[PDB]
């Protein structure tokens, strides 16, 4: 009865584990032993954006490497400019508690959502120029953790009721639902082709879904605590996740197994946000001990540190052209970092 | 070029002017988080101040006392695991923790919930306003004597009524000893690790009580005064 099914489940997991080890010839570090070090990386806070009264929980760069939208728990959703610091909008939220934010690829719509199970969506370019809520996508049970605008008419929202859903804006209903993880889904990131996406949960496992088909394809289990954030490699064949054990792990899609674990013995805090560089060589990770670490994807080296924040860093985002890095935090300040020749 | 840029700055000046206005109202009100179990009279506490009216997610109740506004949040539809959304309430003025005193069964579960809240890294600086609710039913349970608190808390035989006890005139000694034991059980957790960053404010409350917003007011006022004194290093 019950024992018959569980016996197959244990054996089936054994088959996967043995299969993964079969296709593991050498580690990524072993191959990249001859790759020359990246070198010390120094970053200067080019701009500092102020105007949020409480902690910042979300931020998202625009498609034009401009107008980062950030959400804070004072009931504000400000759209900045990142040049001349001018604020473009100060959209007020119905619920003061917001845990995520989004910017549509077309730049016309901006989503929201938080401890209200509702993914409010705003139309920036209204006829009269006044921003008003266009849709209130309800149907999730738990809170909302992340929502990425997959095309201007659809949006994938990851909720705290162990589900991710794909909405249709005009209909306002769940087109498909991905009943996966056994814990809260804390983060989400769509593939560059906008076909697949991944999601890190509170069960220390990040799955991979097919948006069109609607069912999980692969499950990755290398962590040992809740996954707080997750990104994608720019080519779309790898991704990196950060969890509560202060480890960032670079998983691989085709190899279906983890490759490197970026960590240090002096770090025990726990990652809150990750993001790759434009070419994928760098991996920035927003840590809990008030500063971010600029790792090195091909070999764990910790090239640099962006130590400029007072409270914990709960945000990260690299522009489309990879020119700047914005790190919001719980001190209500967004710092736009950049390189220096 | 500057002709169009002035329009952008003019909008940014208008946005800042409204943000400054909203900064005053945001800092004027006190945000409170309400916590408790199924048996705790959380709804009855809310219904007491629900009179002052102005998938669901989180509820909010706005009540104002002595021209001071309070916001009182209660999570409506969230899963059992609350280790991830509890970090949103790291800036609230105080946490209103409601406990059903007359249960004797989930009391240990209530104690563990208080312990995790007290020791949480992001709630290390949030004072907890303890509301030992349903004190009226505790009198009935103790007076009847059918259920003995000793059966669940072994360290009750050696407990003696504290000297600083202030029972209501006409309250039985057995009830006073039993009700203060529960209070001292929670304060043992609070004083174990809370030095000066945050305190506990126990309150014996009945199912219905016309003075509960004042208790929150008279105790949120103490929290504000203590924080300002600690900012000046006078405390």
């Amino acid at each position: 009865e019950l024992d018959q099914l569980r016996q197959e489940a244990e054996q089936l997991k054994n088959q996967i584990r043995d299969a993964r080890k079969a296709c593991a010839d050498a580690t990524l570090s072993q191959i990249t032993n001859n790759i020359d070090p990246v070198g010390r990386i120094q970053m200067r806070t080019r701009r500092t954006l102020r105007g949020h009264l409480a902690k910042i929980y979300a931020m998202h760069w625009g498609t034009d490497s401009r107008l980062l939208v950030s959400a804070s728990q004072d009931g504000k959703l400000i759209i900045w400019d990142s040049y001349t610091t001018n604020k473009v909008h100060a959209i007020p939220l119905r619920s003061s508690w917001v845990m995520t934010c989004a910017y549509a690829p077309s730049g016309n719509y901006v989503a929201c959502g938080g401890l209200d199970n509702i993914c409010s969506i705003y139309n920036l370019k209204t006829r009269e120029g006044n921003v008003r809520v266009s849709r209130e996508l309800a149907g999730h049970t738990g809170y909302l953790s992340c929502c990425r605008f997959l095309d201007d008419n659809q949006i994938v929202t990851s909720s705290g009721d162990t589900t991710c859903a794909l909405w249709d804006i005009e209909t306002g209903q769940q087109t498909t639902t991905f009943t996966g993880h056994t814990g809260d889904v804390m983060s989400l990131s769509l593939a560059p082709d906008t076909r697949l996406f991944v999601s890190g949960a509170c069960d220390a496992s990040a799955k991979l879904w097919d948006v069109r088909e609607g069912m999980c394809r692969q499950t990755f289990t290398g962590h040992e605590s809740d996954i707080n954030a997750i990104c994608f490699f720019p080519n779309g064949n790898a991704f990196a996740t950060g969890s509560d054990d202060a480890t960032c792990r670079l998983f691989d899609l085709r190899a279906d197994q983890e490759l490197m674990t970026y960590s240090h013995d002096n770090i025990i805090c726990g990652i809150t946000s990750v993001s790759f560089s434009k070419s994928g060589r760098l991996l920035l990770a927003g840590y809990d001990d008030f500063n971010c670490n600029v790792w090195d994807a091909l070999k764990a080296d910790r090239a640099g540190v962006l130590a400029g924040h007072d409270n914990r860093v709960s945000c990260l985002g690299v522009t489309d052209d990879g020119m700047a890095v914005a790190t919001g935090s719980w001190d209500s300040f967004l710092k736009i970092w950049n390189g220096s020749s | 070029l500057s002709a169009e840029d002035k329009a952008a700055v003019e909008r940014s000046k208008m946005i800042e002017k409204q943000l400054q206005k909203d900064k005053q109202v945001y800092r004027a009100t006190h945000r409170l988080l309400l916590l408790g179990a199924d048996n705790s009279g959380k709804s009855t506490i809310v219904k007491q101040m629900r009179i002052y009216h102005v998938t669901s997610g989180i509820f909010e109740t706005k009540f104002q006392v002595d021209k001071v506004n309070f916001h009182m949040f209660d999570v409506g539809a969230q899963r059992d695991e609350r280790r991830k959304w509890i970090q949103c309430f790291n800036d609230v003025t105080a946490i209103i923790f409601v406990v059903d005193s007359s249960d004797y069964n989930r009391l240990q579960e209530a104690l563990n919930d208080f312990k995790s809240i007290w020791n949480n890294r992001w709630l290390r600086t949030i004072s907890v306003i303890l509301f030992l609710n349903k004190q009226d039913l505790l009198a009935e349970k103790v007076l009847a004597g059918k259920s003995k608190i000793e059966d669940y808390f072994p360290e009750f035989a050696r407990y003696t009524t504290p000297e600083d006890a202030t029972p209501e005139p006409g309250e039985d000694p057995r009830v006073t000893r039993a009700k203060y034991f529960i209070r001292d059980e929670f304060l043992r957790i609070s004083t174990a690790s809370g030095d000066g960053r945050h305190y506990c404010y126990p309150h014996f409350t009945c199912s219905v009580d016309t003075e509960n917003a004042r208790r929150i007011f008279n105790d949120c006022r103490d929290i504000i005064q203590r924080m300002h004194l600690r900012q000046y290093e006078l405390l």
Partner: nanobody
Amino acid sequence: QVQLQESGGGLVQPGGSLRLSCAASGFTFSNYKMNWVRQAPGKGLEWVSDISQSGASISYTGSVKGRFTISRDNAKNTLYLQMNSLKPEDTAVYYCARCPAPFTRDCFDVTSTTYAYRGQGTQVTVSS
């Protein structure tokens, strides 16, 4: 893969003794405050005992104080809890569950109806 399968359990006469061992793999069995939640039939998950990162900080629930002991072996990667003087209402399914995060003292969701880092469960029955 955080797995916390448990051993021991079964049928024991009232007033006897029993020992449960929970072996943890897939994570560093250290810097993790462990627990020993249990669930009686017809009742919700309840918390029995817990141990600190390296011992030296141990607490029990009221009903089992003085009858159970809890020990851990970081090198052996096992968590132990030894019963003594079993009573008829102690019949329950015991789980070993670790705190959500390392280097912490605020284990939050250990008795929740669902929890990722809990064991399968060992059945303990006290009857004749």
